[PDB]
Structure formats: C-alpha cells, structure tokens
Motif scaffolding. Sequence first.
Motif, PDB file in Angstrom:
ATOM      1  N   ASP A 282       0.739  -1.118  -0.135  1.00 45.15           N
ATOM      2  CA  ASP A 282      -0.070  -0.188   0.138  1.00 45.15           C
ATOM      3  C   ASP A 282       0.753   1.256  -0.002  1.00 45.15           C
ATOM      4  O   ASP A 282       1.886   1.399   0.842  1.00 45.15           O
ATOM      5  CB  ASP A 282      -0.828   0.223   1.152  1.00 45.15           C
ATOM      6  CG  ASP A 282      -2.191   0.647   0.849  1.00 45.15           C
ATOM      7  OD1 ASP A 282      -2.247   1.404  -0.154  1.00 45.15           O
ATOM      8  OD2 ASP A 282      -2.983   0.576   1.829  1.00 45.15           O
ATOM      9  N   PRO A 283       0.753   2.135  -1.115  1.00 46.64           N
ATOM     10  CA  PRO A 283       1.587   3.415  -1.096  1.00 46.64           C
ATOM     11  C   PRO A 283       1.037   4.254   0.300  1.00 46.64           C
ATOM     12  O   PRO A 283       2.037   5.172   0.694  1.00 46.64           O
ATOM     13  CB  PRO A 283       1.214   4.173  -2.182  1.00 46.64           C
ATOM     14  CG  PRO A 283      -0.318   3.430  -2.577  1.00 46.64           C
ATOM     15  CD  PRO A 283      -0.107   2.159  -2.239  1.00 46.64           C
ATOM     16  N   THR A 284      -0.013   4.161   0.956  1.00 44.59           N
ATOM     17  CA  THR A 284      -0.383   4.908   2.063  1.00 44.59           C
ATOM     18  C   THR A 284       0.180   4.331   3.318  1.00 44.59           C
ATOM     19  O   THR A 284       0.074   4.954   4.516  1.00 44.59           O
ATOM     20  CB  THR A 284      -2.012   5.179   2.193  1.00 44.59           C
ATOM     21  OG1 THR A 284      -2.269   6.119   3.127  1.00 44.59           O
ATOM     22  CG2 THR A 284      -2.510   3.709   2.444  1.00 44.59           C
ATOM     23  N   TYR A 381       8.921  10.197   0.878  1.00 47.73           N
ATOM     24  CA  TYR A 381       8.266  10.341  -0.351  1.00 47.73           C
ATOM     25  C   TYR A 381       7.163   9.741  -0.534  1.00 47.73           C
ATOM     26  O   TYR A 381       6.906   8.657   0.226  1.00 47.73           O
ATOM     27  CB  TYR A 381       8.919  10.449  -1.808  1.00 47.73           C
ATOM     28  CG  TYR A 381      10.016  11.384  -1.976  1.00 47.73           C
ATOM     29  CD1 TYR A 381       9.922  12.916  -2.240  1.00 47.73           C
ATOM     30  CD2 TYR A 381      11.285  11.202  -1.624  1.00 47.73           C
ATOM     31  CE1 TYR A 381      10.799  13.728  -2.304  1.00 47.73           C
ATOM     32  CE2 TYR A 381      12.458  11.973  -1.914  1.00 47.73           C
ATOM     33  CZ  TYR A 381      12.052  13.133  -2.083  1.00 47.73           C
ATOM     34  OH  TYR A 381      13.017  14.183  -2.464  1.00 47.73           O
ATOM     35  N   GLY A 382       5.964  10.069  -1.040  1.00 45.37           N
ATOM     36  CA  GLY A 382       4.698   9.362  -1.033  1.00 45.37           C
ATOM     37  C   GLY A 382       3.475   9.870  -0.132  1.00 45.37           C
ATOM     38  O   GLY A 382       3.835  10.693   0.597  1.00 45.37           O
ATOM     39  N   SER A 383       2.621   9.237   0.034  1.00 44.24           N
ATOM     40  CA  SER A 383       1.367   9.732   0.600  1.00 44.24           C
ATOM     41  C   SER A 383       1.333   8.854   2.114  1.00 44.24           C
ATOM     42  O   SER A 383       0.373   9.234   2.800  1.00 44.24           O
ATOM     43  CB  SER A 383       0.052   9.355   0.066  1.00 44.24           C
ATOM     44  OG  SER A 383       0.018   8.036  -0.153  1.00 44.24           O
TER      45      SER A 383
ATOM     46  N   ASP C 282     -16.193  -0.213 -14.728  1.00 47.02           N
ATOM     47  CA  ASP C 282     -15.284   0.223 -13.826  1.00 47.02           C
ATOM     48  C   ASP C 282     -15.037  -0.891 -12.476  1.00 47.02           C
ATOM     49  O   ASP C 282     -16.196  -1.509 -12.342  1.00 47.02           O
ATOM     50  CB  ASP C 282     -16.106   1.332 -13.318  1.00 47.02           C
ATOM     51  CG  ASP C 282     -15.774   1.987 -11.948  1.00 47.02           C
ATOM     52  OD1 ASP C 282     -14.703   2.275 -11.987  1.00 47.02           O
ATOM     53  OD2 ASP C 282     -16.508   1.564 -10.895  1.00 47.02           O
ATOM     54  N   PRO C 283     -13.884  -0.891 -12.176  1.00 41.85           N
ATOM     55  CA  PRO C 283     -13.446  -1.908 -11.164  1.00 41.85           C
ATOM     56  C   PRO C 283     -14.265  -1.739  -9.764  1.00 41.85           C
ATOM     57  O   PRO C 283     -14.447  -2.776  -9.210  1.00 41.85           O
ATOM     58  CB  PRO C 283     -11.992  -1.743 -11.051  1.00 41.85           C
ATOM     59  CG  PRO C 283     -11.878  -0.182 -11.563  1.00 41.85           C
ATOM     60  CD  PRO C 283     -12.585  -0.070 -12.709  1.00 41.85           C
TER      61      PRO C 283
ATOM     62  N   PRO D  31       4.148  11.087  -6.511  1.00 44.57           N
ATOM     63  CA  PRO D  31       5.306  10.162  -6.878  1.00 44.57           C
ATOM     64  C   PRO D  31       5.328   8.818  -6.585  1.00 44.57           C
ATOM     65  O   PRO D  31       5.751   7.946  -7.108  1.00 44.57           O
ATOM     66  CB  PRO D  31       6.359  10.957  -5.994  1.00 44.57           C
ATOM     67  CG  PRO D  31       5.681  11.531  -4.964  1.00 44.57           C
ATOM     68  CD  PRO D  31       4.310  11.902  -5.610  1.00 44.57           C
ATOM     69  N   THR D  32       4.575   8.494  -5.565  1.00 46.41           N
ATOM     70  CA  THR D  32       4.287   6.820  -5.194  1.00 46.41           C
ATOM     71  C   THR D  32       3.162   6.327  -5.812  1.00 46.41           C
ATOM     72  O   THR D  32       2.981   5.255  -5.796  1.00 46.41           O
ATOM     73  CB  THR D  32       4.140   6.860  -3.708  1.00 46.41           C
ATOM     74  OG1 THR D  32       3.341   7.355  -3.139  1.00 46.41           O
ATOM     75  CG2 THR D  32       5.245   7.479  -3.082  1.00 46.41           C
ATOM     76  N   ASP D  34      -0.191   6.732  -5.603  1.00 46.11           N
ATOM     77  CA  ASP D  34      -1.210   6.365  -4.866  1.00 46.11           C
ATOM     78  C   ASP D  34      -2.703   6.274  -5.453  1.00 46.11           C
ATOM     79  O   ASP D  34      -2.911   7.366  -6.200  1.00 46.11           O
ATOM     80  CB  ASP D  34      -1.367   7.054  -3.472  1.00 46.11           C
ATOM     81  CG  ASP D  34      -2.596   6.620  -2.667  1.00 46.11           C
ATOM     82  OD1 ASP D  34      -3.528   6.144  -2.987  1.00 46.11           O
ATOM     83  OD2 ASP D  34      -2.099   6.727  -1.263  1.00 46.11           O
ATOM     84  N   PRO D  35      -3.171   5.176  -5.429  1.00 44.88           N
ATOM     85  CA  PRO D  35      -4.631   5.345  -6.431  1.00 44.88           C
ATOM     86  C   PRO D  35      -5.617   6.471  -5.683  1.00 44.88           C
ATOM     87  O   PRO D  35      -6.751   6.778  -6.541  1.00 44.88           O
ATOM     88  CB  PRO D  35      -5.253   4.030  -6.101  1.00 44.88           C
ATOM     89  CG  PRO D  35      -4.423   3.283  -4.780  1.00 44.88           C
ATOM     90  CD  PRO D  35      -3.080   3.917  -4.920  1.00 44.88           C
ATOM     91  N   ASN D 131     -13.089   8.558 -19.775  1.00 45.31           N
ATOM     92  CA  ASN D 131     -13.627   8.289 -18.585  1.00 45.31           C
ATOM     93  C   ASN D 131     -12.610   7.983 -17.593  1.00 45.31           C
ATOM     94  O   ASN D 131     -11.407   8.057 -17.654  1.00 45.31           O
ATOM     95  CB  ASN D 131     -14.191   6.680 -18.757  1.00 45.31           C
ATOM     96  CG  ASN D 131     -15.358   6.653 -19.689  1.00 45.31           C
ATOM     97  OD1 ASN D 131     -15.690   7.537 -20.394  1.00 45.31           O
ATOM     98  ND2 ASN D 131     -15.590   5.511 -20.416  1.00 45.31           N
ATOM     99  N   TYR D 133     -11.491   6.303 -13.640  1.00 42.79           N
ATOM    100  CA  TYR D 133     -11.855   5.084 -13.057  1.00 42.79           C
ATOM    101  C   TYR D 133     -10.777   5.229 -11.802  1.00 42.79           C
ATOM    102  O   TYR D 133      -9.825   6.047 -11.591  1.00 42.79           O
ATOM    103  CB  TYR D 133     -11.431   3.917 -13.672  1.00 42.79           C
ATOM    104  CG  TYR D 133     -11.994   3.533 -14.802  1.00 42.79           C
ATOM    105  CD1 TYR D 133     -13.690   3.659 -14.838  1.00 42.79           C
ATOM    106  CD2 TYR D 133     -11.801   3.385 -16.128  1.00 42.79           C
ATOM    107  CE1 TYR D 133     -14.451   3.766 -15.924  1.00 42.79           C
ATOM    108  CE2 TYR D 133     -12.514   3.206 -17.085  1.00 42.79           C
ATOM    109  CZ  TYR D 133     -14.011   3.294 -17.064  1.00 42.79           C
ATOM    110  OH  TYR D 133     -14.557   3.101 -18.219  1.00 42.79           O
TER     111      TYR D 133
END
Lengths: 508, 508, 508, 134, 126
Positions: A282-284, A381-383, C282-283, D31-32, D34-35, D131, D133
């Motif tokens: 997970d990036p978070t 870095y990252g969220s 959509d997923p 940068p990472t 994140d979705p 679209n 998503y």
Amino acid sequence: VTAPLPEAVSSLSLAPTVNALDPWVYLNQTEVPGGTFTVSSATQPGSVLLELEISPELNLYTSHLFRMYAGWSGGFSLKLLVAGNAFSAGKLIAAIIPPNIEVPNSAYLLTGFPHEILDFRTADSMEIIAPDIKNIDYHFRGDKLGKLVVMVYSPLRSTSADFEIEIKLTSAPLPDFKFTMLVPPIQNNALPIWSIPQAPPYSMVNPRSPLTPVVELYINSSYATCNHQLGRYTIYQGAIGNSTFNPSGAWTATCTAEAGSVTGNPNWRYALLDLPDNPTFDPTLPPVPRGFCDWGSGVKSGNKQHLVCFTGKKFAGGFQDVDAHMWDYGDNETVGLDNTYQRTIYISDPSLEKDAQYLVIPMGVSGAANDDTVQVAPNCYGSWDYAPTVAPPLGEQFVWFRSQLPASKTTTTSGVNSVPVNVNALMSPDLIRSAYASGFPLGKVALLDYVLFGGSVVRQFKLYPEGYMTANTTGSNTGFIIPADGYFRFNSWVSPSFMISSVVDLNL
Amino acid sequence: VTAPLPEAVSSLSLAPTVNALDPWVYLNQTEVPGGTFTVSSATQPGSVLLELEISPELNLYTSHLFRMYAGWSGGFSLKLLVAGNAFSAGKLIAAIIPPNIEVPNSAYLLTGFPHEILDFRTADSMEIIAPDIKNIDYHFRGDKLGKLVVMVYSPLRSTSADFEIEIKLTSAPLPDFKFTMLVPPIQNNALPIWSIPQAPPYSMVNPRSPLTPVVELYINSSYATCNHQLGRYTIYQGAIGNSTFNPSGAWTATCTAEAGSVTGNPNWRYALLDLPDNPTFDPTLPPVPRGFCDWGSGVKSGNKQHLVCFTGKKFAGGFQDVDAHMWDYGDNETVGLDNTYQRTIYISDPSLEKDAQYLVIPMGVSGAANDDTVQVAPNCYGSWDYAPTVAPPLGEQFVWFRSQLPASKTTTTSGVNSVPVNVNALMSPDLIRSAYASGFPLGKVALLDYVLFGGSVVRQFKLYPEGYMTANTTGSNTGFIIPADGYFRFNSWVSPSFMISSVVDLNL
Amino acid sequence: VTAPLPEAVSSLSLAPTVNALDPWVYLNQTEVPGGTFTVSSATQPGSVLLELEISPELNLYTSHLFRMYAGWSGGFSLKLLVAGNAFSAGKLIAAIIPPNIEVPNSAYLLTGFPHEILDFRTADSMEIIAPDIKNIDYHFRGDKLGKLVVMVYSPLRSTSADFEIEIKLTSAPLPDFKFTMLVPPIQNNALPIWSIPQAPPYSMVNPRSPLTPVVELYINSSYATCNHQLGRYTIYQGAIGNSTFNPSGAWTATCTAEAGSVTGNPNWRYALLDLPDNPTFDPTLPPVPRGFCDWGSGVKSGNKQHLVCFTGKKFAGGFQDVDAHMWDYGDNETVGLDNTYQRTIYISDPSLEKDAQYLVIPMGVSGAANDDTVQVAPNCYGSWDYAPTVAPPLGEQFVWFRSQLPASKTTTTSGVNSVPVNVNALMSPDLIRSAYASGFPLGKVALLDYVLFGGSVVRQFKLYPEGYMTANTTGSNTGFIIPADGYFRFNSWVSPSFMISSVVDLNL
Amino acid sequence: GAWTATCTAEAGSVTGNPNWRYALLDLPDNPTFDPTLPPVPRGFCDWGSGVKSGNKQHLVCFTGKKFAGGFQDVDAHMWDYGDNETVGLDNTYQRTIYISDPSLEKDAQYLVIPMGVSGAANDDTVQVAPNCYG
Amino acid sequence: SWDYAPTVAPPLGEQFVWFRSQLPASKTTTTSGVNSVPVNVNALMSPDLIRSAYASGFPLGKVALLDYVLFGGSVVRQFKLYPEGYMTANTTGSNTGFIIPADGYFRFNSWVSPSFMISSVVDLNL
C-alpha cells in the motif's frame, strides 16, 4: 478589575446535581496551568503569546477537580504577575474570543473582539475577568469554548540594557463557578501536574541505536532541523513516522533478491525489504519495515560511504553465515531512490542469489561517513504518514540522546570495515510514556528541570508535545557535553513561545 | 442499628481551615479500591480476609479529593456485596479495630470488637458504619488509623458447590467528613485507578532477548517457578536482581581473557567478565554487568551444550573480527561456578591470547540445549541482592512473554552453529513503566483484563507487585499459547489471594 | 433512594408549545424495545451488556407518541427483570452515563457513575430512575443523550448451573416528561413493533433459484460460513453484493463469445459476459450482471463438474436454438479466474463462432457436483463492494431457504445432462421487504418465532440486520429438516449476543 | 501553467502499430502513484478522441526530449490516451499514453503540450472527455 | 556488612579542608632499618572539636558556619562544618597544595543550610 465582556451567571436550573466547590478554592489565587510566557525585544508584534481555553483547566484546583465531573459552568478571575522593570515599554492585548470564532493572526483584527490593553508599566497585578460564554445552561466535555488570547500589541522596547519580561497568569474561579454530575476520575482533561518517573537518561533506549546505551545529552548549533523517522513520538498519537515503542525488537529486518546488480557497480546487488505490516504494497502505508534503520549516508554517495549491516541467508529456522556486509538505500543514480527512506536497498556482496531472503541488522557506517551524514535521515516521499521535519524556535537548539557506536575492524577478506560514529535521537520512548499517560494541556509545552549533581546544577529544557526537547542557548558550539546521569523533574506548563531564563553557554 | 460504634464528630477547632465536600459525594456510594476478595471451603480458618484502614482512600471520590488536602476527618459508611447463592452455608464477620490494637485470628475474639455478622446467602448489601477513631482533632498523612477487618465467622461447610465467593466493598463518606488545608494535588500514594497505555505485548521489549520481539504469551504448568535476574521489576524497589530498564542497551558486555582453560580441554579459554558498575568488586554488589545474559545451560553440560555469543578482539575505537563463538558460565566441573551467575566465563576459541578485552553479545544457545535449559537461569550465591526465586500461588500459573530466537547456521568452519530456541521473560519493563507512574496500593494486586479479537475473548491475569502475572488454569499443558496482539486493561485492585473467575483451560 | 441522580425538571420556557401526555402513560409500565439480553459464565469480563440511550424510545407508548412530536424532555423510570434462580451467584450493575462521557470497561470504574447494583437471585424488579441529562431546554432528534449501561459487577462463578439468564428492562416515563411541537406522525426511526405479514416460507422466492419454490428450512452444522452474492439483503444499505429484489427478472443474462478456448480442450469456447449496469467496466462496479448466478463448481473442477444453462444464438427479436449447454466461470486453471465471480466464462460447445450475443439461463449443475459444491460460491477479488463472507456466532447455525433443482436428463446427444441438487439461500427478499417498511433499532436483532402445525411447534430464530437467521443447536447434523409451511412471528428486539432459550436439537 | 506535462518513455508499442510507442506520464504530485491521488498531472488535457479510434483520429501535442536544461527537437507529434482495444485504460484518463513516432527512445523524458486533434475528430468527440476510474 | 565510614565528597563549588601534619622520615644507616620517606598525612576532622560540638549539637538539619580567625582579627577565614564530620570552603582556582596557618581558632558564626554558599571565598591561586 476589568471585564472586557460581562459575566452571565448560568442559573443551572437544568443541571441534575449542582456540585459546589470547596469555598477556599475561590479565595486562593493559583497559578494558571500553562499561563506562563515571556516577552522579549525580539518578539514580533502581533504574535500570539498565550491561547487559553476558558475552562476548569485555568486553575490548578479546578483542573484537578474537573476529572470527577462531566459538566461545569462559570468564569474565572485572572491576575497578571508581570515581572517588569523600570526601563522597558510596550503594550499587550488580551482579547476574549467567543466559542466557534477563529482566532485572528493580526492585532488589527484582534482589537475587534472585547479586549484590554496591557501596558507593561502598569500591567502588574491587574485583574482580568475571563467570562464563560455559552448559549447552554452548562458545558459538557468536548464542547467548543471561548479563548483568551494574549498578543504583543507594541513590541517590548527598552531605554536601557535589554530585559525579558516574564509574565505569569494567576487564576481563581468566580463565585458562580459550579460543577455537575460526579463521574469516575479518569476523564480526558490533562493532569495539571505531571509526575515524571525518577529515571536517568542513560537508562533509556536510543531509538536510532537500541544496542548502544545513551551516554550523553547532546546539543549542536548546526543541527537546525530533524528529519528522522525513528525516535519520533507525540502525545496525541504516540509513535509517529516509522518509530516504534520497542526499537530493539524492530531493529532487524529481511529483504529479498531482485535479479539486479546496479548500473555501474556489479558488486552492489539491490534488495527489496519485506513489509510484514504492509504486505499489500500500500502506498499509504510505510514502504519500510516498522522501526527499521533511518541512518543517512549522503546524496549520490557510495564510492565513499555506506551503511554496515549483519547479513545472512535464512535457510531453515535460522540464518546462514551472518557477516558484516556493506549496504545502502536505493540506487546511486536517481533521485527518489538514492537517499530515500523507501523499500529498495542494495547490498555489496557478489553472492546474492535469486529470490533468497536475507537478514539485515544495521550496525554502523563505513568509508568516509561522518556524524553529520548519519544525523540527516534519508528523505521520505509518497502519501504514507511519515514524521514531518521539525525545527526548534530561533534561539533554542534541540537536545539529543547521543550514543557511541563502536567500529568493527576486519583483518580478512570476509566482512567490511566500519568507522566509529555517534548517533543522536530526538526522544526515547521511555520519557514520553508517562507524558501521554497523563497528557499535556492543550497547546502547552512541558518545562522540565534536568537535575544534575544532586541539585547543584539544574538544566531547564522545553519538552514539546511533538516529541523533542529544546534548550535556550547562547553562543555557538559544534558539540556540547551534558551528562546523562541526571534526571528529569517537571517544572511547569509553558506556552511554546516561552523563553527559558537559564541559558546554556555553548562556547565553554 | 447498623452502627456498632457511633461516630464521634470532631469540632475541628484546631483546623486552620475547614474545607467542605461536594454534598453529592456523601449521597452516592462508590466501590472501595482494593476491597475485593474471595472465600471458599479452601480458606484457612482464622485467616484475615481483608484489613482496610479507615481513610479517604476507601472511596474513589474522597481519594481523589484527598490529594488536594493536607488533612481529613470523619468516618465512612461501608456496604458488603457478597456474590453467593443459596448453597453458601457460612457466616462472615466484619469488625472495626481501633488503632494500636492487634488483630486477633479468631472470629470468636472478633465478636468483642464492634462488628457485624452477615450471611453469605444474603442478596442485600450489609451496611456498616466505619467511624474515624482518633484522639486528635483531625488526621494527617501517616497516622495510626482504625482498621476494618473481615473474617470468616462460620466456615463454608457446604461441599456440594465449592465455588469461590467474590466479595466487594462499596463506600461513601459520612456526612461529617471534612478536609483541611488545601494543598497542590501531588502525592506519593498510589492512584486508585491505573490506566495501562494499551500498548500490545508485541510492542514490549523482551528483557531476556531484546533483539527478538515478543510474539506470544506463554503458559507452562511444568515451570511452576522462576529464578531469573533479567525481567525482574518490582513496583516498590524498581528493577531488582540484574534487570535493567533498557535491556538492549545493557545486553552487550566485555571480558578479559587470562592464561588458562578448563581442565578438560584447552579450547575453552577462561575469560573474566568486567564490571563497569562494580569496579571495586564488592561482594555486596552484583558480580555481573547490569543487564547481562542469564540464560541457563545445565549442570556439567559443557560437553553437550553451550551458549553462543558474538565476540571479537577489542581494537582501537571498535572491535576486531566479530564472529559467533561458543561460551558458558564458570567452568564445567565445580560448584558453584558451573550454572552460576558470576563473573568467570570461558570462550571456546584458542585465539584469546592474554589480558585482552573482548566484546560479548549473547545471541546463541547451541548443542542439546532446549527451552527448558534456557528457562532455568544460573544460580546466585553471593552476598549481593539477587532477585529471589518466585513461584505462583497454588492453582495459578505464570504467564510469560515469549520470543523466538532464530538459529545462527554456519557452513564454513570459521563460526559456530546454534539451534533455534524460545526464551521466556517473567515481565517486560514496558508494562511496569506504566505501573511506576501510578503505583500499587499496599498489599494489593492488580487484576488485568487481556482483551483479544476486539473484545470477543478476554483473558484475566493478576499482576503481582513482585513483578509477575498469573492466571487460573485447569489441567496441565506443555506450552499453552496466548496471542500477543491484544492489549492490557485494568480491572480492579484485588488481594493477593484473590481467585480469578475466568479460567484458562490448558487442555486445549 | 432508588434515584442515584435526581431529575432536573425543565421549565420548558423556550418550548413554543408544551404538549402534555396521557396521564395514564406515566402510571403504567411497559417493556423496553431492544432491552433484552442474556448473561452466563461465558460472558467476557468487562463487556457492556446493554447501552440504552435515555429517549422516548425506551417506552412503547412514548415511542408511539414521539412520532407525533418534534421535541421532548424528561426522564424515565426503569425496572430490571432478572430471570435467575437461587444458583445464580453474581452481581449486576446498571449505571447512568452522562452525554459526552466515554463508557469504561470496568464495573469498578462504573461505580463512580450514578449506579445501582442488583443480585441475579432477586425475584423483585430493581427500579432505577433514568434522568434526562441535558444542558438544553428540551431535546430534538439527533442529540447527544445520556446512556444506561449494564455491566456484570460480579461474574457468575457458580459452575453448577450454567444456564443463560435472560434480563428484561421495563420502563415508564417520569411525571415531568413532556412533548413539544406537534408534527405529522411520520419518522425515519424504526417502529418498536414489527409485524411480519405471515407469508409462509414456501411463498417466498429463492434468490439463488427463482424458478424453484422454497420447500424447506435448512440447518447444516458443516457450513458454518456463507460467501454468497445472491440473497444478501441488509436492513440498512438494502441489497448488497450482486443480490436483487427481483431475482427471477435478473436471472437471465447475455454473453459475447470470442475466438478462444480453454488451453486444455477447444470445446470450451470463451464467452465474455456483458454488463448492462456496468458498461464502463469500472473496477469499483460489479463485474457480473446484477442478480446473475453465483453457484460454485470447485477448484480446477471443470474436468469433472460444471454448470448447465439454457443458451442460444441471439437472433433478431429473440434467441435461436435455445438448448441446454455446459458452462462454468473463468477457465479451469488460473486463479483467480476459476471459482471466481467475475466476467469471463466458457460455454462447452463448438457452435460459438465469434462476437455474437448468447442468452444464458443458469438452471443446471452437472457432473460430480453436489450440494456442498454449489453451496460455496465463487470468490470475489475486485475493488467492487461484494457481499462479505459472514459466519454465525459460536453455538449458532445458519438457517437456509432450501429448494430442489430437478435434473435435466437428455437421451439425445443434442443437449447436456444434469444432476439433481439442492440449493440454499441465506435470506429471501420477501421476508426483508417487510423489515424495510419497519426497520431495525440500531444495534438490535429481531428474535422471530417460526410456528408450525398451528402453534404446536414454535421455532425461534434471530434475524440479524446483516441478512441472515440463526438458531441454537446441540450436536451436529448433515441437513436437519425444518418444514416450510409455517409462518414467521415477531417476538421482540434482542441484542446480537442474545442466547435463544429454545434449542433445535440436531441429533434427531 | 499546468497545461504542459512530461512523460517517461518505455519500450513497446501498440499492437499492429510499431510507431505508436508507449509513454508514461510523470506525476509530480503523486510520486508514489497512490490510487487515491489522480493518475495524471494537475490540469492535464482531458480531450476526447473516441472509444477505439486510433486508426481514424488522435490527439496532437508538441513533443521534445529534454537533452539538458531544456527540450530539443520539439515538433508536432501524434498521441492519444490508452492503447486501443482494452477499455480498461483506453479512452480513459489514466497515466499511460502512446505517442506516434518511431524515434522515441526509452527511458527518456519527453515534453507534451496538447494543442489539437488530427485525424477525424470533430467538436462532439472532443466534447466527451475520457472516462475516469478508481 | 560492617558499618564503615561512607565515602563522602564536598558539594560542587567548594573543597575539603584538611588537618595536615608532617610525618618525619625514619632513615637507617645499618641493615636493620627500612629507610622511610617524608610524607604528609591529612585527616578530615579532629575528634576534640566534634566533641565540643556534641555538648551543644547541631540543629536538624543545619551545618555550622565557622569563622577561622587569624592572628587577632583579619584575616578571618570562613568555613562550613557539616554534621557528617567534615569542613569545607568556597574556592577559586586549583592550587593543589594550598596552605592555611594552624595558629588561629574557630568561632561559631551561624547555622546555615547544607546548600548555603559562603560569602567569603578563598582564592586558591597564590
């Protein structure tokens, strides 16, 4: 006696039980738990010196009593104890902000609220009525409350040698103050008095070097910031960043192979640290095993300094041929991997085969590594929630927990060689334990006495709720020696703008 | 009348200030801190079930108030809550013992005192007035006080249902109760309510293995005793034996080798462990470095099992050729040197020349050693104050913080090879650190709830002030498993002989 | 006094209209909706048995009145009805929690609150006054309210009789209770009494087999879990997973065939199921048509069992040559495609040319498949919100709506041959449709009576708001039988941990 | 200020079109990747190019390669979102795009300034954004 | 376990004051001697002055501030006498080997706390 906003006695007809206070609590003026602040010639005009919620926490006795009550009502009477002088002039503004109103950042807007002008010449022993503003019969817990805001209206100027005016608020509940609905004394309001356990610093674990005891409190003029992700604790949510409450148990990690060998250095083979707490990638979530090493080596380095760890192959129920290898974070060619607190690392050893899992126990640094290099942690870095970079207020320096890492000398081709290095941590988890056990007053800073030599020498430090200690210092010094055999004694709660009267002379 | 001894109302003429109470404190009743005990047919005749001093500590509200006041006066009204059924044939006697009077061990003698007798079958609380027996105007802290004593007037003879009868006390101050001399609310007396910071056990350090996290809470019927010098923390005198509050920082040690070896073989070079904290080598001081390893090997067990440590020549600024070697305590033949927690050891290598310092990092256990061998620590004989051998009360078993030591496998002949083993700790310092800030009531034991799976499963343990936790068990098990991802919750203060209602069934 | 906290009578000066009550509502006592719970020796220590907000919903009469009124004020008088015998050794504590105060998990802490302690052996109701704790003149809907909390003061230690103790609460409003601001009697709050329309189970549609009637209520100890996407209806968020309120209308689906087949054999032509409700693919949206079949086949089970559907070429205005063919989910090898509730399927026929729509009417199950295979639905992995896998509480078993699927035997080689099989549904939408009109009280479970043979036999089930019914069972059975010609009757609202008195004996 | 974006080149092209080289947009704010964060730079072009219409219409951008301290050989190139076929990422506002030129080499950084439509796009097809998503 | 005199140190900022005596050497010319060496012996406290203190006693808990008068008035040195049996003085410098004449006499000044700082500070640097 001046009342910027009138007091309205709140009948209390709806209160189930009206719990009267001890009548002597009304007649004894007591220092406000946190209403201590300092004005100096360097204090910018319009800067907030004191934000106090008008609550039972304004008085020591009522603060202690509030832990048994679900509700309360009534205002407070505040007395200014201004340790002024004959040479300084200036103005202070004390405004009453009603609940649900944001505190402005300028004196111009602050004069819109009911307020009082405090002149240092005559501000001493002046009485301020802190009204209880509410549209309800009595307050519950967690309700929005009015504020007392003290701002510099005119900067403190002196006609002679500069002096720092020390101002202390003293409070007593107004006779209409009442409590309601006795409850067990485990309520959330912070204890007015914090009892630090009697424990010397050298008995505390160094989060950034658990295996090495802390032997010194360290002050450096050149460490203006801290970006570490280890040894970062807060009163609110405890361990933050990548910190942990068991640094020794979280020190060791494992990594897996990648089928890569670094562009430029074939002997350096990458590795991917596994994340038992972040298996879904997970990036978070932290892209680093919990509590793993956050030592710094530099930027675009590696031909001159690395990190040293014990590396072994896990075969079955153990590890194979643990030897001191030479490793570092990320690659050495791109920003975002090199000098970055992330998953990818590389280990300098020719034999690192496919998909094998390797133990990593960081133990030191090699090459031209220095105390300054290890002091600066790799970037994040990252969220994912990482500990923010912190800096002490100007005129104050961080107080560090310093450890002495011994070197590791090898006389053969097996293993690498390390250099002695000192490692500093913002805060050991041991000190914070009782701190968030008892809690801090909202927005206040713990002022601690570091008792040394049985009381002949006492250092004063400011312990911020964000998890660091600062000391008021004069002069400059690349390194200051403080014995770790003393102990911390709680002095009082102060605002973060408070200036410690006792100043450490660094240039000694 | 439910008042065998009338209340003597003090005029409080000598009190500088008479401080009234919240009138609702009198009107509501509150559980007595430490007023919980159990009885059964197994209770020894003549035993005193509870000695309670008549003091503000009897009530939670009055206990919280008393931290604010120097003095107090007035009695309490107590209620006995007996949790028995129609099969509980017996009688209970509660007596008021005036100060300076010894407590007899016969209920027949207790009848001479002001007393009340209540049946175990009654579902109604029995009210007893506990007067403040004093010849002085009011009490300070540290005075002789009247005592409430509860004994078994008629023993439980009904053998049909041999279930424990939990008995609670609930108190409220009498209307004449008063306080005097408002003081800052900081005191040395233990808080009535202790709040554990909810840190999970795996976040707690293992004193006997700092590098490995606690992964398990361990129950073993076969142990039934503990003679350890690490992980021994008492509420009163802090860390005892050789235990340390920073186990990781004190794990490593140093030794000096002399020209000698075990008479059996010359490979076991004698090494003399140095004592930084005991340089005078005083017999009344510990003969080992603080926090050093206390794993057991056995008696004359050197021919088949040893301990494994990371050791190396102490060079300038570090250590030379740190590799895994083999070691043990004392020698392999004489007593007490073998299996003895003392200063002399041997290192299984020929490289130790003479008079040279060597690092020692115990991480091993090798050979035929298992969990049982490492569980039993080496003995202590000196005049120094070592931690005594403790055993759980009958029907109760120790619960241990368990960690898994990975093996150190070696294919090359340079190093030694170890065996995986589990190590237990009597108590982690992280849990006791919270208890130090609060403290225990004298002669009382903390009953703790260990909640698992979000509260679905709750395990109940008794944390003794001597520094161990126990639970009721049925049958026997060779390593019953308890998950270490829960968190500890404080239930109440109970007597050391309290029998926990929830039972851990070991035959699963 | 049975009033630990006195009632604070509101003057209601701010109420636009003060609406009096029927004076006989005060004088008579009424069962509390959702005020039923059970205790035993298996109750976890520190567990909160019941959290009841002091509101007009406490009483049936006041609850019915409150739909007519915008506001209310005043407290309630509550009675505890404990159904215990002389062997019930224990104590129960009921405490009044003021608003904004967290509920502790210790009875010893609960004693600090206004509380009453009652014995399980008492045959008389214990009366407790529940005051309306408020700092406002009167309450609207959606305010913080005082809470009644019931905990186990002394645990049940008598092991002789481990029977559940049903505890009821019965309430009447206090004489000062008032209503304000007459409003139309329509509200979103759940009705205190739910009336099932007495429709027999065989008149309810089977979501997992709409064409076949429910002929049986099914108990199976071996199932113990359910991961279904059909027949999943929740009281709060309606139909979940892929379930539909019109299972028959959504049973048929359409697929498009592509040029491909399973790598094993070419007869299994790949078909891509189309998504009328998810054309954007959509997923976060379901990957299957709403209400489509979710029968299970197994893992790699295509070589021995499949599903059978009626399929045909989609001609103009209809379908061409609709015959029974063979199909399954995904392919037969990879994961997750086999046994996966997703979009790709294969049809066992060579006639699928390319890019053509084909009807799909799942009616089959053929080969070695049995009840167990069809019971376990294909897994879900996507980011869409699929129905979670639910399991009954320990000691309780799911009750299923069972239907019999007739076989599709074929002598000619044109069609495929199926095997008779039984299919279970977690819940029929017909039963939940009645519950939607009424709604469930928050955190409460409907206890239902299932009467049979004109009332001679009554089965008791708990309808959880998550959308399943459970019953207590002894022993284990492989298909216990319950007739489906009865009708459901609402008994009362109970806690989710309530233990049903009537037990279904499975060993018959 | 946010109209210009940069993409990272990778090997491979859309099947059947070797010159439709794959590109991967840079995400300075994510940068990472994140979705929860947008899989595009802030303010990047959201013009529509049709469902699966790479054969007949595209998007036009100025494309250069950052040699050093700037971009060189900037020219109008041919680009579109996704890779045709798979509706999961084609006609979608995701990270990945393709640029229709063979000279693109990996893994280099390329400038993208969307400036028009080329093949058969009209007002209606650019009106409908791709679209989103996730 | 026997009750030996605990090791004591003066509070930071002040040094011990020792009663110093010159021990003569025992030279030998024949082979029957050992030929000792001159040395000085320091003691914390003379028994008799503490004996004098026993009759009056020290208030609990205070240390005695003593004036040491030299040759009839000035210079007057000022010491602190602790109940544990040692006497201290505030100093500036190191001067290992500072000497104070033994011809004076002690004169009680007042009772002070153990943490009291002596106003009269002797300068070690000669």
